[PDB]
Amino acid sequence: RPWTSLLLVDAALLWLLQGPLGTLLPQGLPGLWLEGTLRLGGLWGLLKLRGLLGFVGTLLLPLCLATPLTVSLRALVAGASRAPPARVASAPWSWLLVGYGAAGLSWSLWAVLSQVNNKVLMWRLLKLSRPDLPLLVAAFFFLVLAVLGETLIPHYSGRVIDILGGDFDPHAFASAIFFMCLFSFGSSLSAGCRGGCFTYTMSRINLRIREQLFSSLLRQDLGFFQETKTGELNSRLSSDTTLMSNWLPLNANVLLRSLVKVVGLYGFMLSISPRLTLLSLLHMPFTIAAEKVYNTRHQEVLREIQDAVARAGQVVREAVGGLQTVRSFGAEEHEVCRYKEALEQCRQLYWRRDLERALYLLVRRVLHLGVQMLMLSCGLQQMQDGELTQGSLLSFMIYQESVGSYVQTLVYIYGDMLSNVGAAEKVFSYMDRQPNLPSPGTLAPTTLQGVVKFQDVSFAYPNRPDRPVLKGLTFTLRPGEVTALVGPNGSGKSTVAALLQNLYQPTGGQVLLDEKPISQYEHCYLHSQVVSVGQEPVLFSGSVRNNIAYGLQSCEDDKVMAAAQAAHADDFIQEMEHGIYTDVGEKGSQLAAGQKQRLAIARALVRDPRVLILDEATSALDVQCEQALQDWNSRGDRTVLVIAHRLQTVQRAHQILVLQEGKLQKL
Amino acid sequence: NTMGHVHSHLQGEVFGAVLRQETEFFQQNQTGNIMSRVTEDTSTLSDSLS
Amino acid sequence: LLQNLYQPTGGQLLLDGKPLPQYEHRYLHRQVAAVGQEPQVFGRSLQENIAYGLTQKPTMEEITAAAVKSGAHSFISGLPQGYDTEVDEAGSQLSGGQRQAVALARALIRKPCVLILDDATSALDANSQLQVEQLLYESPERYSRSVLLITQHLSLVEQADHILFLEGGAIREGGTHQQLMEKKGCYWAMVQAPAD
Amino acid sequence: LLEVQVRESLAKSSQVAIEALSAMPTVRSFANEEGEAQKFREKLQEIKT
Numbered sequence: 001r002p003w004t005s006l007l008l009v010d011a012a013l014l015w016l017l018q019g020p021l022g023t024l025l026p027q028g029l030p031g032l033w034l035e036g037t038l039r040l041g042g043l044w045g046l047l048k049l050r051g052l053l054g055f056v057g058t059l060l061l062p063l064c065l066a067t068p069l070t071v072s073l074r075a076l077v078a079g080a081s082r083a084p085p086a087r088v089a090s091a092p093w094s095w096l097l098v099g100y101g102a103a104g105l106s107w108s109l110w111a112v113l114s115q116v117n118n119k120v121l122m123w124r125l126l127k128l129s130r131p132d133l134p135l136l137v138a139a140f141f142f143l144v145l146a147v148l149g150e151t152l153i154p155h156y157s158g159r160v161i162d163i164l165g166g167d168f169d170p171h172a173f174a175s176a177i178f179f180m181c182l183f184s185f186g187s188s189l190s191a192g193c194r195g196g197c198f199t200y201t202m203s204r205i206n207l208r209i210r211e212q213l214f215s216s217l218l219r220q221d222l223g224f225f226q227e228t229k230t231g232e233l234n235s236r237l238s239s240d241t242t243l244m245s246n247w248l249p250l251n252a253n254v255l256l257r258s259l260v261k262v263v264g265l266y267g268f269m270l271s272i273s274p275r276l277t278l279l280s281l282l283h284m285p286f287t288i289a290a291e292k293v294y295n296t297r298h299q300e301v302l303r304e305i306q307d308a309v310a311r312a313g314q315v316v317r318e319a320v321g322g323l324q325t326v327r328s329f330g331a332e333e334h335e336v337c338r339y340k341e342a343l344e345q346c347r348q349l350y351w352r353r354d355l356e357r358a359l360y361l362l363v364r365r366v367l368h369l370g371v372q373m374l375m376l377s378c379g380l381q382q383m384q385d386g387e388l389t390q391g392s393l394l395s396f397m398i399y400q401e402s403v404g405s406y407v408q409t410l411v412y413i414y415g416d417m418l419s420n421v422g423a424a425e426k427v428f429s430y431m432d433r434q435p436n437l438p439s440p441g442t443l444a445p446t447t448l449q450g451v452v453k454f455q456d457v458s459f460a461y462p463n464r465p466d467r468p469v470l471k472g473l474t475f476t477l478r479p480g481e482v483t484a485l486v487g488p489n490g491s492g493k494s495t496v497a498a499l500l501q502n503l504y505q506p507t508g509g510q511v512l513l514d515e516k517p518i519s520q521y522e523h524c525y526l527h528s529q530v531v532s533v534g535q536e537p538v539l540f541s542g543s544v545r546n547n548i549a550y551g552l553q554s555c556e557d558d559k560v561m562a563a564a565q566a567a568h569a570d571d572f573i574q575e576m577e578h579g580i581y582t583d584v585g586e587k588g589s590q591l592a593a594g595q596k597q598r599l600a601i602a603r604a605l606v607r608d609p610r611v612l613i614l615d616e617a618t619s620a621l622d623v624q625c626e627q628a629l630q631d632w633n634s635r636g637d638r639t640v641l642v643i644a645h646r647l648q649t650v651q652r653a654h655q656i657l658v659l660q661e662g663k664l665q666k667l
Numbered sequence: 668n669t670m671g672h673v674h675s676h677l678q679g680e681v682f683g684a685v686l687r688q689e690t691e692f693f694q695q696n697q698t699g700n701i702m703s704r705v706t707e708d709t710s711t712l713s714d715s716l717s
Numbered sequence: 718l719l720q721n722l723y724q725p726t727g728g729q730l731l732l733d734g735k736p737l738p739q740y741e742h743r744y745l746h747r748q749v750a751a752v753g754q755e756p757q758v759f760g761r762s763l764q765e766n767i768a769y770g771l772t773q774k775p776t777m778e779e780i781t782a783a784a785v786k787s788g789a790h791s792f793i794s795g796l797p798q799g800y801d802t803e804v805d806e807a808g809s810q811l812s813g814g815q816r817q818a819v820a821l822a823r824a825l826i827r828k829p830c831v832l833i834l835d836d837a838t839s840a841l842d843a844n845s846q847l848q849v850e851q852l853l854y855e856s857p858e859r860y861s862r863s864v865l866l867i868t869q870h871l872s873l874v875e876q877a878d879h880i881l882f883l884e885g886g887a888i889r890e891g892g893t894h895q896q897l898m899e900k901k902g903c904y905w906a907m908v909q910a911p912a913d
Numbered sequence: 914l915l916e917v918q919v920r921e922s923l924a925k926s927s928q929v930a931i932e933a934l935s936a937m938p939t940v941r942s943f944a945n946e947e948g949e950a951q952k953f954r955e956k957l958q959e960i961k962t
């Protein structure tokens with residue numbers, strides 16, 4: 001409907017302008033401009049009245065002003081000395097058909113052509129690369145020197161060739177050889193320096209990315225680590241960082257060379273023929289549209305590839321971390337099958353990426369060939385008409401093909417850099433994520449009494465906020481007295497321990513240390529004054545001494561030995577190969593369970609904490625050590641919270657608190 | 668396509684070989700180390716190869 | 718050693734009269750099942766954790782029967798998604814005692830001939846402790862398997878048919894509860910240590 | 914030899930990261946994020962050299 005109406009109205013307007021209306025209009029460029037304006041006004045009015053301008057308006061202004069404007073440009077480049085132009089309506093049907101085709105093709109190209117996230121991520125990458133500015137300055141300097149030398153080499157190469165082909169003068173041959181070698185030597189030196197600088201800049205950027213991402217991850221809240229997987233985080237930290245800096249040495253060099261050369265080449269081809277120079281801009285629309293489509297697809301597939309790589313890395317992480325459990329069920333083949341399935345998904349994503357890239361390269365090669373054929377045909381027509389000579393035509397063809405190649409390379413490389421930077425979106429997201437934690441405190445009092453107070457504390461884990469765990473808990477822990485928190489599994493005792501250490505914030509009520517919120521105390525002071533021996537202690541690979549003093553900047557060996565003696569860990573420590581310098585293994589694997597618990601107790605006690613939270617600290621402990629570590633923990637100036645599953649070796653506690661289903665029960 | 672097949676096959680073979688070792692091989696080689704060798708060394712090798 | 722993770726340097730360890738290395742990997746590891754001291758739980762649904770390593774995926778009837786035997790049905794059923802509840806990588810969702818119940822169900826779903834319980838009752842509550850006691854000394858299936866019960870809860874040790882006091886890597890003594898109590902050796906000293 | 918050393922240093926960094934990110938409650942309960950960062954930075958310094 002709308003298209004037929006547009007055609008009919010356009011035909012009627014052109015017929016009217018062909019008749020007595022045209023005679024009133026002037027002749028020449030003003031006549032064509034006025035005819036186009038009248039055509040546009042008539043179409044706009046007759047479409048606004050009929051309400052068909054919703055989607056056909058875009059095509060109006062070009063279709064009506066493509067013929068006049070074109071003519072103007074010609075009269076501005078080839079001159080107006082030629083005959084006055086003919087009116088659109090009076091022109092034959094071929095001009096109208098070509099105008100329709102031009103308007104439609106421009107409309108389609110603009111639809112394809114119409115990013116901020118990529119730009120902001122690239123700006124962030126530039127901010128991260130700022131510290132490497134001197135290296136980039138040196139690289140740019142060497143690049144400029146290399147280009148300048150490579151502009152001089154060809155003259156002497158040609159001199160050598162000419163001397164060989166024609167009369168051979170030994171002196172000229174030697175001089176040409178010497179100068180060719182000299183300039184090649186200088187250019188090669190500069191190119192090597194440039195490449196080395198770019199490579200080192202890339203490596204520094206990669207290491208900086210890794211450090212910043214890891215330091216940002218360390219600051220996140222614990223719900224972040226509950227909602228994510230360690231293998232996938234490691235996959236990000238080891239692969240997306242590589243992607244973010246994987247192209248500088250080559251892409252930067254190519255971009256900068258092309259930028260240096262394009263301006264001069266365009267100047268030259270303007271000097272030869274501005275008409276053909278304007279004609280040569282035919283390629284840019286198609287180039288940019290194709291790049292946009294391909295870049296969208298490429299970025300999508302790159303993100304999917306990184307996700308799949310993370311999943312496969314998690315498969316490997318789980319299989320290797322729990323090796324003794326997979327091997328005790330004869331399930332290695334199952335893990336290998338899972339990994340092979342993940343690798344198959346990754347392979348299919350890789351194949352999609354490569355196939356699309358190959359198709360894009362084929363498409364742009366075809367575009368290049370077609371546009372070069374078109375330019376050659378137009379230049380041949382001009383040369384036949386006598387506008388330009390053979391040498392001018394050849395020089396312009398060389399220059400215009402060179403600029404076409406340079407512009408295509410610029411567009412492709414810029415899009416490739418944007419795709420590579422934007423495919424690593426999770427890295428930037430993690431680096432810029434704000435932990436769901438309260439603002440850091442500043443209280444570091446010299447003297448701490450240790451009086452803890454839970455006041456109507458209600459807590460629900462942020463991962464599952466719909467299920468409360470604590471319901472109006474309220475109690476007091478005094479120094480010099482022992483409080484035994486007892487209840488069944490799932491009661492919420494470890495949740496109380498976590499809240500008392502400020503690992504999580506209560507959804508209601510308050511946790512007070514010395515009458516002030518515990519979140520208002522400094523991180524280091526708080527966690528050096530309030531220490532816990534966890535349910536299943538986690539050790540880190542390294543010496544026993546590091547594990548005991550894990551988090552202390554400077555702890556003397558006498559303190560470590562005293563802590564070991566207090567926890568009864570000195571008995572089995574001296575039986576090790578190197579005493580306190582013996583490697584414990586990953587997760588303390590080369591140890592018995594009771595030895596791990598004793599080492600954790602020694603680590604907790606080395607700090608002389610004001611508040612000590614023993615969360616099942618004597619579960620994997622033999623009866624003798626359980627009796628030994630019964631009640632000496634308190635010293636009259638230390639608050640102690642002994643969490644026990646049952647009323648086992650806790651009846652010697654001053655206060656008893658029974659917890660069931662998150663509710664405190666009075667004695 | 669051929670290089671993708673090569674990459675996948677090599678990664679699978681390396682993972683299987685790692686899992687075929689003995690119980691103490693995983694106390695000398697730590698989890699992150701083995702994971703980096705399996706997931707990252709093979710990928711770089713395959714990219715360079717292609 | 719009894720799971721074939723390590724080979725003995727001396728002596729010999731025979732299952733049904735033949736060394737463990739002579740048995741197929743998966744056959745051996747579905748005929749000998751162990752609950753570890755700190756059981757490992759993978760990041761999958763509880764249904765996939767309980768049946769982890771079985772060539773033929775068991776039906777939900779078998780999985781729920783195993784969970785009932787180990788006492789994990791009570792808390793698994795109460796979960797919003799039930800057996801489809803995805804577990805965290807470290808198993809932090811499952812509290813201590815629940816993870817051991819899931820590991821025990823995983824061990825029991827295989828119907829093994831040798832059942833190792835390595836401090837598996839440390840975290841189990843009263844209900845799961847009663848369930849494991851019933852499984853050991855009351856279940857009709859006890860006649861089809863031998864149990865190695867490494868533990869420190871004397872309630873289960875007292876009923877044990879045999880007791881071995883492995884101190885310093887050597888068995889200082891053995892026999893039934895009455896015999897060791899009469900001997901007044903290391904076992905009696907350990908039992909009466911809290912009473913001192 | 915150079916590339917072997919590079920791969921080994923990357924593997925050590927991966928070990929540090931994996932060990933730290935798997936025991937975050939323990940790292941935070943002792944206020945030792947800075948120490949883990951320092952270990953990672955030492956490995957990265959090897960890679961840089």
Ligand SMILES: Nc1ncnc2c1ncn2[C@@H]1O[C@H](COP(=O)(O)OP(=O)(O)O)[C@@H](O)[C@H]1O
Nearest residue numbers: 461463488489490491492493494495809810812
């Ligand atoms: N990190 C977590 N994310 C979500 N839910 C959790 C998390 N940790 C524990 N829970 C849930 O909260 C309950 C509180 O029990 P918990 O304090 O962990 O054990 P217990 O009462 O035996 O000391 C758990 O049984 C579990 O259902």
Ligand SMILES: [Mg+2]
Nearest residue numbers: 493494535813
């Ligand atoms: Mg607990």
